[PDB]
Design an enzyme around this catalytic site. Structure first.
Site, PDB file in Angstrom:
ATOM      1  N   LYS A  14      -2.148   6.944  -5.401  1.00 20.73           N
ATOM      2  CA  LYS A  14      -1.798   6.198  -4.193  1.00 20.73           C
ATOM      3  C   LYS A  14      -1.374   7.142  -3.073  1.00 20.73           C
ATOM      4  O   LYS A  14      -0.574   8.053  -3.288  1.00 20.73           O
ATOM      5  CB  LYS A  14      -0.684   5.183  -4.484  1.00 20.73           C
ATOM      6  N   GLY A  15      -1.922   6.920  -1.880  1.00 19.33           N
ATOM      7  CA  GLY A  15      -1.613   7.741  -0.712  1.00 19.33           C
ATOM      8  C   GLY A  15      -1.016   6.914   0.410  1.00 19.33           C
ATOM      9  O   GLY A  15      -1.710   6.581   1.375  1.00 19.33           O
ATOM     10  N   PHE A  22      -0.436   4.183   2.409  1.00 19.00           N
ATOM     11  CA  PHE A  22      -1.003   2.871   2.738  1.00 19.00           C
ATOM     12  C   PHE A  22      -2.336   2.624   2.042  1.00 19.00           C
ATOM     13  O   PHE A  22      -2.887   1.524   2.115  1.00 19.00           O
ATOM     14  CB  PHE A  22      -1.165   2.698   4.256  1.00 19.00           C
ATOM     15  N   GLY A  23      -2.846   3.646   1.363  1.00 19.09           N
ATOM     16  CA  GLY A  23      -4.134   3.545   0.686  1.00 19.09           C
ATOM     17  C   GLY A  23      -4.119   3.947  -0.776  1.00 19.09           C
ATOM     18  O   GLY A  23      -3.124   4.472  -1.282  1.00 19.09           O
ATOM     19  N   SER A  24      -5.227   3.677  -1.458  1.00 17.60           N
ATOM     20  CA  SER A  24      -5.438   4.142  -2.817  1.00 17.60           C
ATOM     21  C   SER A  24      -6.716   4.967  -2.843  1.00 17.60           C
ATOM     22  O   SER A  24      -7.622   4.736  -2.039  1.00 17.60           O
ATOM     23  CB  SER A  24      -5.541   2.963  -3.784  1.00 17.60           C
ATOM     24  N   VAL A  25      -6.784   5.931  -3.756  1.00 17.52           N
ATOM     25  CA  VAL A  25      -7.970   6.775  -3.898  1.00 17.52           C
ATOM     26  C   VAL A  25      -8.578   6.624  -5.294  1.00 17.52           C
ATOM     27  O   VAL A  25      -7.866   6.670  -6.303  1.00 17.52           O
ATOM     28  CB  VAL A  25      -7.669   8.261  -3.586  1.00 17.52           C
ATOM     29  N   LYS A  42     -11.226   6.542  -0.429  1.00 17.05           N
ATOM     30  CA  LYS A  42      -9.930   6.016  -0.022  1.00 17.05           C
ATOM     31  C   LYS A  42     -10.080   4.652   0.639  1.00 17.05           C
ATOM     32  O   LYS A  42     -10.893   4.479   1.554  1.00 17.05           O
ATOM     33  CB  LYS A  42      -9.184   6.988   0.898  1.00 17.05           C
ATOM     34  N   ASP A  66       3.421  14.836   6.546  1.00 16.35           N
ATOM     35  CA  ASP A  66       3.493  14.467   5.129  1.00 16.35           C
ATOM     36  C   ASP A  66       3.114  15.637   4.201  1.00 16.35           C
ATOM     37  O   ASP A  66       2.540  15.436   3.133  1.00 16.35           O
ATOM     38  CB  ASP A  66       2.587  13.250   4.889  1.00 16.35           C
TER      39      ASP A  66
HETATM   40  N1  LIG Z   1      -9.263  14.546  -6.413  1.00 20.69           N
HETATM   41  C1  LIG Z   1      -9.642  14.292  -5.149  1.00 20.69           C
HETATM   42  N2  LIG Z   1     -10.805  14.689  -4.646  1.00 20.69           N
HETATM   43  N3  LIG Z   1     -10.787  14.243  -3.376  1.00 20.69           N
HETATM   44  C2  LIG Z   1      -9.639  13.570  -3.038  1.00 20.69           C
HETATM   45  C3  LIG Z   1      -9.228  12.969  -1.840  1.00 20.69           C
HETATM   46  C4  LIG Z   1      -7.954  12.363  -1.851  1.00 20.69           C
HETATM   47  C5  LIG Z   1      -7.124  12.357  -2.996  1.00 20.69           C
HETATM   48  C6  LIG Z   1      -5.794  11.718  -2.994  1.00 20.69           C
HETATM   49  C7  LIG Z   1      -4.920  11.840  -1.892  1.00 20.69           C
HETATM   50  C8  LIG Z   1      -3.653  11.226  -1.918  1.00 20.69           C
HETATM   51  C9  LIG Z   1      -3.245  10.492  -3.033  1.00 20.69           C
HETATM   52  C10 LIG Z   1      -4.092  10.356  -4.135  1.00 20.69           C
HETATM   53  C11 LIG Z   1      -5.349  10.972  -4.116  1.00 20.69           C
HETATM   54  C12 LIG Z   1      -7.589  12.976  -4.177  1.00 20.69           C
HETATM   55  C13 LIG Z   1      -8.859  13.592  -4.195  1.00 20.69           C
END
Ligand SMILES: Nc1n[nH]c2ccc(-c3ccccc3)cc12
Length: 292
Positions: free
Chosen positions: A18-19, A21-24, A43, A137
């Site tokens: 989780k980032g 306000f979003g999820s990845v 994202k 951040d």
């Molecule tokens: N492993 C990843 N490859 N590319 C990405 C882009 C964003 C995030 C991310 C960023 C914030 C929270 C959770 C995941 C993770 C990755």
């Protein structure tokens, strides 16, 4: 247009975290539906309201405008029909977040490796500042590992552009704030600048040299210093008073003195006295050179 991604062809593989306000999610973009497509990071917003969608679209434009070795690569966008939900497509970096990577391998990542990462983080931040963007951040959870030799800044969910004629951005209605990474002026006045990013970078450096040890984490240590009895808004009050009186995170055990000096310089109450990212990258590279 390879930057146009059709949603129905994105296959979920696993959650990446989780980032704010979003999820990845790790997804395979598989238009041939034969499991041979590229694996990408997607994202999306958890609550895609008007205001959030507006901010998410600015975030996407910010990332699209950044091209640097130490910044995660923009790949494209997904648009939904009707209400216009947005997904951000990025390269997938398979070693995950630096926070998890370092927590996993700990001291098996040596000082030479830690300073290589520091330098790369510094260079990504220097480049960001040339575009007049303020990250807001900067933390090891927002930094990603591509391979053993390269890290990239991985999230830009709180990133703001400075006004043309100001060197700070002021936040009028603060959301969830990573206060244990905040410069004093961000705590007291909600003022964010390249110099508050430098403060947070000092905290990242601390994280790196504590090897993400839970008892040594910035939240744990600042709570210890203000008293674990402090709660809610009172945490902010006591933190402000602590920093004003030069209460600081301690030198991590085993930390080289030159590296500790860098942290302490980043944590200057005097905003103008903090080092620049250009100078920090020069200094770290020199230290790496001395060690090698
Ligand atoms: N492993 C990843 N490859 N590319 C990405 C882009 C964003 C995030 C991310 C960023 C914030 C929270 C959770 C995941 C993770 C990755």
């Amino acid at each position: 247009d390879p930057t146009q991604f059709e949603e129905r062809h994105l296959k979920f593989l696993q959650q990446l975290g989780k980032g704010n306000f979003g999820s990845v999610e790790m997804c395979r973009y598989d238009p041939l539906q034969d499991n041979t497509g590229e694996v990408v990071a997607v994202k999306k917003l958890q609550h895609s309201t008007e205001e959030h969608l507006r901010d998410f679209e600015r975030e996407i434009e910010i990332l699209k405008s950044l091209q640097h070795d130490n910044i995660v690569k923009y790949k494209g966008v997904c648009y939904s029909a009707g209400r216009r939900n947005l997904k951000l497509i990025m390269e997938y970096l398979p070693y995950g977040s630096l926070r998890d990577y370092l927590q996993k391998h700990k001291e098996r990542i040596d000082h030479i490796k830690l300073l290589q990462y520091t330098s790369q983080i510094c260079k990504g931040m220097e480049y960001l500042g040339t575009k007049r963007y303020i990250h807001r951040d900067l933390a090891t959870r927002n930094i990603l590992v591509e391979n053993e030799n390269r890290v990239k800044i991985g999230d830009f969910g709180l990133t703001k552009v400075l006004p043309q004629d100001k060197e700070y951005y002021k936040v009028k209605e603060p959301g969830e704030s990573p206060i244990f990474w905040y410069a004093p002026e961000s705590l007291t006045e909600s003022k964010f600048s390249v110099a508050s990013d430098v403060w947070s970078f000092g905290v990242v450096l601390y994280e790196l040299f504590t090897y993400i040890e839970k008892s040594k984490s910035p939240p744990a240590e600042f709570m210890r210093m203000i008293g674990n009895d402090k709660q809610g808004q009172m945490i902010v009050f006591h933190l402000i008073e602590l920093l004003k009186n030069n209460g600081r995170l301690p030198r991590p055990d085993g930390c080289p003195d030159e590296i500790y000096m860098i942290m302490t310089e980043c944590w200057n109450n005097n905003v103008n006295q903090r080092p620049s990212f250009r100078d920090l990258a020069l200094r770290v590279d020199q230290i790496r050179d001395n060690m090698a």
